[PDB]
Amino acid sequence: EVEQDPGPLSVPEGAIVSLNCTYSNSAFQYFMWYRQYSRKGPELLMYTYSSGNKEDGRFTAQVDKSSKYISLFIRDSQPSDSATYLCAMSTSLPNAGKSTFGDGTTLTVKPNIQNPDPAVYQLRDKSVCLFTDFDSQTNVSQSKDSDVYITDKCVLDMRSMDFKSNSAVAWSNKSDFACANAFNNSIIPEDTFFPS
C-alpha cells in the first residue's frame, strides 16, 4: 500500500514543488517516479535504489526508508512540468518485475503573465462569455448555478508574437445569464474590464 498526496496541486512558474508518498511495506527497495501527460502513457522520470538522494537537473528524488517517506522535488517549476506524477515501488529481489503505484498527484504550473489586461467578453452567438488576460494569481471558481457551465483557466501561446494568455469559458442556455454575472462565484481582479 502506497499513500500518495491526493492533490490537485497548482503553483506559479518558478516555485519549488514537493511531491510525496508514504508506504507500509518494509521490503520496498526500488523507488520510481513517473510523469504522465494528459491522455498519454506514464513515462519514467527518476529512479533510485534504497535510502538516499539523486539529483538530475531541476529534479531531486529522495528516499527515507526509516520513516517510509519518499519525495520528488522540482526546482524552478516550468509550465511544461504540468502533468500527473505517480510514485511506484518494488520490493527487494525477487519481485517478479512487479511495482506498486500510488494514486498520483496532478500538478499545474501556472505560466507567468508579463502584461495582464483582465476582461470578460461576450462572443457572438446558448450564450458564451470569455474571461481572458488575467495573471496566474486568479482562481476561476465553478458557478453556483447548475445550468451555467465554466471551464477552468486555460493558457494559449501565440508563439510568433511571444505572447501567452489565460482564459476561462462560461456558457448557459438559461434566461438571465449575462457576462456581468457569469464569474460572480470567482474572486476576479478589481480592474477587470467589462465592455458594453
Binding site: 502513457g41 519514467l44 512487479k98 462572443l123 457572438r124 510568433s160
Partner: protein, 244 residues
C-alpha cells in the same frame, strides 16, 4: 524509434459483449504487463508475463484473460463486458535484466466504456462562437471559441483547422471533458476550446476557420433500432469565416 503500441485506441461495448486488446513491442523485452487506470487514480496490474507462452495474475485479474502468443505480443481478453470494466488500459514492457533501474516503457492507452443501453450513446454537437468586437478594439487580438456538447461516451479529440491546415499555435483546449449533469452516472459530456489570432487575420474575409471533433462511437457491426442516426465513429465540425 522503437516503443510499446496498443490496438484499438478506443472502444464502446454493450454489457456482455467481448473484445481483445493487443499489445506490441519490438524492443526484445522479456516482461510484458496489462494495467488499468481509473480517472484521477493509479495503475493497477491485471495480468503480466515473464516470457512467451506463460502468464501470471496481477492485483485485479478477475473478468480478464491473457495470452503471450510470442515475445512481441501480449493479448488482453474480456469475455463478458461489465460496467466496472470502463477504464483506460495500459500495456507496459521491460528487459528481464534492466537498463532503466526497474522502470518500464508504457503504451499510450486504450479507452474502454461499457454501456448499459446503446440508446444512451450520442455524438457531439459542435458550435463555433465568433470573436468579440470589444476584444478586437481593446487588444488587437481575436478569440474564437468551440463548444462540443451532449456527447456520450467521452471518447473525443478536438482540433482547429485554418485554411484547411491544422493549427497548434494560439490553441488552448480543456484537458478533460466535463459532465453536463454531475448527479447522473451516465451523464453526457461537454468540451471547450479557444483559438486566438491577430484581429487583422480575423478581419481577412478569405480566412476560413473550422473546429473539428473526432468522436469514437459505435461500429458497423453494432445493431441500431432507433429513429435517430446511428452514433458511429465520426467527425463533427462547425465553421467560421473572417469578417472585414
Amino acid at each position: 524509434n522503437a516503443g510499446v503500441t496498443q490496438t484499438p485506441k478506443f472502444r464502446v461495448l454493450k454489457t456482455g459483449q467481448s473484445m481483445t486488446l493487443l499489445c506490441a513491442q519490438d524492443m526484445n523485452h522479456e516482461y510484458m504487463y496489462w494495467y488499468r487506470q481509473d480517472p484521477g487514480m493509479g495503475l493497477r496490474l491485471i495480468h503480466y508475463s515473464v516470457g512467451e507462452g506463460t502468464t501470471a495474475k496481477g492485483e485485479v485479474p478477475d473478468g480478464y484473460n491473457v495470452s503471450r502468443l510470442k515475445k512481441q505480443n501480449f493479448l488482453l481478453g474480456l469475455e463478458s463486458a461489465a460496467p466496472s470494466q470502463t477504464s483506460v488500459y495500459f500495456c507496459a514492457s521491460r528487459y528481464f535484466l534492466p537498463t532503466q533501474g526497474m522502470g518500464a516503457f508504457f503504451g499510450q492507452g486504450t479507452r474502454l466504456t461499457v454501456v448499459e443501453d446503446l440508446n444512451k450513446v450520442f455524438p457531439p454537437e459542435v458550435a463555433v462562437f465568433e470573436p468579440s468586437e470589444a476584444e478586437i478594439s481593446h487588444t488587437q487580438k481575436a478569440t474564437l471559441v468551440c463548444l462540443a456538447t451532449g456527447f456520450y461516451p467521452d471518447h473525443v479529440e478536438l482540433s482547429w483547422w485554418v485554411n484547411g491546415k491544422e493549427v497548434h499555435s494560439g490553441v488552448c483546449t480543456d484537458p478533460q471533458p466535463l459532465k453536463e449533469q454531475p448527479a447522473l452516472n451516465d451523464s453526457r459530456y461537454a468540451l471547450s476550446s479557444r483559438l486566438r489570432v491577430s484581429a487583422t487575420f480575423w478581419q481577412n474575409p478569405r480566412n476560413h476557420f473550422r473546429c473539428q471533433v473526432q468522436f469514437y462511437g459505435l461500429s458497423e457491426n453494432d445493431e441500431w433500432t432507433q429513429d435517430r442516426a446511428k452514433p458511429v465513429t465520426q467527425i463533427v465540425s462547425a465553421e467560421a469565416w473572417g469578417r472585414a
